[PDB]
Design a protein around this nucleic acid. Sequence first.
DNA 1: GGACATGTCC
DNA 2: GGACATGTCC
Lengths: 200, 200
Amino acid sequence: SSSVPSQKTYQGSYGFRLGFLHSGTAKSVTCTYSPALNKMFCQLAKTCPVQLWVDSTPPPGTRVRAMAIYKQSQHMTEVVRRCPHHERCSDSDGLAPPQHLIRVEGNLRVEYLDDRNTFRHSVVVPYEPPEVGSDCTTIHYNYMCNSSCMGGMNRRPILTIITLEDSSGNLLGRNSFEVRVCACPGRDRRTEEENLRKKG
Amino acid sequence: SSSVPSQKTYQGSYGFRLGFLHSGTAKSVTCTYSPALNKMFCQLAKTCPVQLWVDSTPPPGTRVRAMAIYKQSQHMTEVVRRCPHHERCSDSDGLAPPQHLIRVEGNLRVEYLDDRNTFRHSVVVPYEPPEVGSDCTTIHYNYMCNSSCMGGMNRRPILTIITLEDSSGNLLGRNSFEVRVCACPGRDRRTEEENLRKKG
DNA sequence: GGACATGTCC
DNA sequence: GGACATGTCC
Ligand SMILES: [Zn+2]
Ligand SMILES: [Zn+2]
């Protein structure tokens, strides 16, 4: 069995997809999303709102997991972790282990997990349906290193894989998106989309 | 008493001064020295030959200490250390503590010291006079982080202070030089000397 | 070695 | 935000 989680999109029976806020790139903003690249550009430890959309309501006890993997085949097998510098920075919120790249803020039932076999990190919260009048649920993620962090992601792109899972562990839905954590999300999104057009 | 070692040049009664190899900058070389800037440019963990010159022979038991401090007044008080990434890299040679920035290679009597009061690191070897026919003694230093290392020197310039000390601890001589540890010593020396001329 | 990268200065 | 920085790609 593979030690690398599938990144394969699975809309599933509940019509699961992700949504992202608009947009830009007015200024080198804190967080911006490129539909063309399927890529979030954001800043170190800043809020990244991700929306969960479903057509049919998941059953009670459904959970939402986020996990990072390296996007490139050459790096897929390596566990995505915080670099040694940021790991020792004591910026923990009391819940997140200092090694974990991805945090969820503002959730009283967050769980941080480390796979006993793959050693990969993930963070889980309960799924909750939208309030009446709302079409989605929003989770605030934080990425606790820059993509460029020496001894950590080291300039390698990652994907965040979001899985919708029932109590029993059945996969109900899966989506994923590329992430670049950088100093200037607005600038870098512009640069990448222009290189896509010209050279892609 | 100051927790910051003096960088004040002291040629002393023995006529102590430093010498550096020539030069460049043919290519982005591994190690190059700028007389105008009093600055060594070198690469991570590569050999940096430093020559010790004296007019009168130091007495037996004389020692040679190297220590780094931040050059800028704003950073002088902070101890110069390896970054967390390089510290944990297990590149130790069996003698140097993994936190120490400055190593001496090729010396059977090297001592690595940490000041009980200032916590500053230094590395010491016995002073030895030149062989007959030679005008100097050469020590091979290594700098085990780049100047840019996140969580370490963090792009701040350092000075290396070389002290000639007798057995008893008397200061016989002192010299110092700025260091930039970088990927492209040749390129950066050229850039800095040109900015000195134009803007200095 | 030239171009590109990507965090920082101002 | 433009210029500069500084490690990396090729
Ligand atoms: Zn980091
Ligand atoms: Zn380092």
